[PDB]
Design a protein around this ligand. Sequence first.
Ligand SMILES: Cc1cc2nc3c(=O)[nH]c(=O)nc-3n(C[C@H](O)[C@H](O)[C@H](O)COP(=O)(O)O)c2cc1C
Ligand code: SF4
Ligand code: SF4
Ligand code: SF4
Ligand code: FES
Ligand code: FES
Ligand SMILES: [K+]
Lengths: 429, 43, 212, 263
Amino acid sequence: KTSFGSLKDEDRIFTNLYGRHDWRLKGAQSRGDWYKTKEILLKGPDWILGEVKTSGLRGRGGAGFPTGLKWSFMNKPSDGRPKYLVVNADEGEPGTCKDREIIRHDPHKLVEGCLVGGRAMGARAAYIYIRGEFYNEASNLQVAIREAYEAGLIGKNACGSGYDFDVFVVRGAGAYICGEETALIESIEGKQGKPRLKPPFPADVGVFGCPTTVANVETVAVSPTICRRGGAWFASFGRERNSGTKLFNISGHVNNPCTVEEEMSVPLKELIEKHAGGVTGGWDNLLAVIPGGSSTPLIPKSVCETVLMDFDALIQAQTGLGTAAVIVMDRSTDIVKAIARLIEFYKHESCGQCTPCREGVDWMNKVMARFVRGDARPAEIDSLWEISKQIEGHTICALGDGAAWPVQGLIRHFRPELEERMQQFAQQH
Amino acid sequence: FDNTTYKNLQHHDYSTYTFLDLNLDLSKFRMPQPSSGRESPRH
Amino acid sequence: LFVHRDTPENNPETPFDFTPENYKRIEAIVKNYPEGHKAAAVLPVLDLAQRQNGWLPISAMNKVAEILQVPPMRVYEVATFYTMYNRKPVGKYHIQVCTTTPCMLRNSDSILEAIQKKLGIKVGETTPDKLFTLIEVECLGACVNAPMVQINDNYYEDLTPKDIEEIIDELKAGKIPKPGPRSGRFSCEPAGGLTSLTEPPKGPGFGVQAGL
Amino acid sequence: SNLIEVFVDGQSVMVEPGTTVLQACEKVGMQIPRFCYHERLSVAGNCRMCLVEIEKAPKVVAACAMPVMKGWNILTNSEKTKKAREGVMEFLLANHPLDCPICDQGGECDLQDQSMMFGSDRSRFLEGKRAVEDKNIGPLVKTIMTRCIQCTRCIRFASEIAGVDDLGTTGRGNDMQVGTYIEKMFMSELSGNIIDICPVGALTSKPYAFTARPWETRKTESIDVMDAVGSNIVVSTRTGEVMRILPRMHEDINEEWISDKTR
Ligand SMILES: Cc1cc2nc3c(=O)[nH]c(=O)nc-3n(C[C@H](O)[C@H](O)[C@H](O)COP(=O)(O)O)c2cc1C
Ligand code: SF4
Ligand code: SF4
Ligand code: SF4
Ligand code: FES
Ligand code: FES
Ligand SMILES: [K+]
């Protein structure tokens, strides 16, 4: 195939995405959840890891690592320590709200995913770390977990398969950095959410010091369907190495901001028009799009004309798919102010552990605030580029990179706007 | 078959202790926890 | 501020203890973690103290340290790292307005100013009656429903200056307004009609591969 | 048999498995710059001053925490490594106060000296600086926490060596502060050692305050008599007057610590 999109409802995974059908166990089973889970578990971890491998699934949390290979790090003999699956429901990336819909409207997909994914890793339990602001969603998930326990689908002898598995829910307390895998582990352990250096990797030393795999909610929630329908069925969607369906969030200056499931490698233009009702004021009114949440560099309208929404396509456009949270800005937007507010966000979210982000991001925030008013000289633009490069790749965790990249996208594509603002300020003063 | 009403309305009646009450309810379903061997890293 | 100074209202002798029922809830919290790692319960238990007490005096932090046998400083570290912990009293309704870019692009400013005018306070302040506290927050994870606010545990979405002033009017009257979007849709589906998931979902066994 | 071969700027060296990149550089007499790393404390990896290029690897690694792999070539003087050091030093100094004339660390300051050897020679920071309020932790250790670079050495020493968990970090991001949160005195028989391990003038000796500069002191290597341990010390004198007492490293006796009575 060479064209992508127009996913049919028969091939959509999250069929209760909009919560118009019963989200509890009875509705979930009627939609195909918890069907033949016992057979899947009895197939074995290597079979399950094979299907996730053949499916081409990649991490939906933002980094996009191949899921089958990543999960196989746990497929090793035990050494006396328990093994854990940690499901990342921190959902903190600005623009991203897909995981919220899964937890509250399709909770049993996530619960079954924990069991199937946990079985592949040989984990004894799953901890679902959900951000503390998602109180009503956590309670929904807690109700679904109780139904699964009462029905015998999880817990002792889960699904009558002779495999024990617990699913715990632990809430955050307000921290974007606790979405980072190792910071999430540190938070579960009762410490400040500060990322760990690697090595060790979590598959060797993770939560409570034990072998751990951290997986995104969407990554986990689709695994049971991949096992039932096959990895080949999943890989028949999207371009090579960009397999499967993807949940998108389209927000900002669109007519009907929404969440939707669509094929990977759908054209960005087609996604915005078919599902979000087009750019506010027409496509000609488009200024820039942030395609994968605040951490991904923006792209100008010219690039958005033909780009495809998948990992490889957006990398060649000098950005990334990220969480696939599309933030649309029309030509009435103050683009410098829009980006400056994201840097302010990263300033408020940096854990402060390591020097380049603790000091660099606060420094970038001060410079951007002046760039908004034009109270700077053009020589500071190349200075700000260099500062962002001193943060990128020098910090413990990827938040520092996530703050550097949006600044780089602004300078790459809107340098004339920044310079024009400094010229206007100078004549006014 | 209806597709025109919202079927996620239970959370309009959740309260301060809803989440922890459910956690207390689930306590009898869990497998026994593993042990590091000591009461804490400071023991 | 991230340093503490004792006052008559907030000092180690300020009364705090968990109610008998909250001690039962604490036991279930601590049983969720491997033995020898009780410190993992610090966040849920600290949040439990806030839910009972409304905020976290230094004496509440000290009690959590005692129950879990963790040094009090390690609890202070948690209380000051996570922004959902209130180390000063807050009003009965903690209004939290998202002002990050996706919500800002859809006019969260009009929501912020509407609240300030109606309550006659500035961001960060509490009303003289101590009913409302207003602050700005970062992305609350409901970006497609912008602009939006969180009041205590509830989200209010697709807001306009009229809608939020109606929510505040209901709160002042002892009524508890229903959460969710106020614009016409139910959650995150596009307004003007579903563009997907229109047909009834398939049932058990659909598309299942052979061998299972 | 156990040893593996790695290279430091092309020079072969044999190291036990688990040896860090920084330790492998010691073996050939190269001292990687550091702030947070102390060989008697647990590894932290937060200052990032020890970033070093590994040949053929696109990303610099934290030498103090990264275990060295077989066949790695550690480029301790490459352009990538030098630019990494300059960038980190630039961030460390962005909010640091212009205190050297009034700061007791001046003249024996690891921030000053590694800035001289590995940092740039000028500033491009055009904003205003952070200013942080001071903490009283007793009559022995003066705090000027605007000088603190958040290396967490004092926190790790207190928890691990002194066995006192009173020091920590409060807040987040650029506002992260080291202290006790509450008003508490750090009175331990080993407390004065945090003065030595603090790389900057954030923690300084109260009795010693303002009396001398390091270059003008004569160092007499002696022994402590305040107990029967026999701690090795250095007696700093100037113009015939004892100015202060410092630990002298002896692995088999006091390592590099002394008690507050000795100090
Ligand atoms: C600052 C920061 C925030 C992150 N937030 C999330 C998040 O909210 N949800 C998530 O799944 N991954 C988040 N991640 C990515 C995780 O670190 C990790 O890559 C992911 O949980 C792995 O799961 P996956 O392979 O299924 O995507 C974040 C990373 C960073 C650096
Ligand atoms: S990059 Fe920022 S968030 Fe990540 S560890 Fe360093 S200071 Fe913390
Ligand atoms: S700590 Fe060092 S660099 Fe900072 S003021 Fe003192 S002498 Fe100068
Ligand atoms: S006070 Fe000194 S030792 Fe402690 S964190 Fe700050 S710079 Fe490091
Ligand atoms: S930007 Fe406001 S909820 Fe995400
Ligand atoms: S000395 Fe290695 S990061 Fe600080
Ligand atoms: K010092």
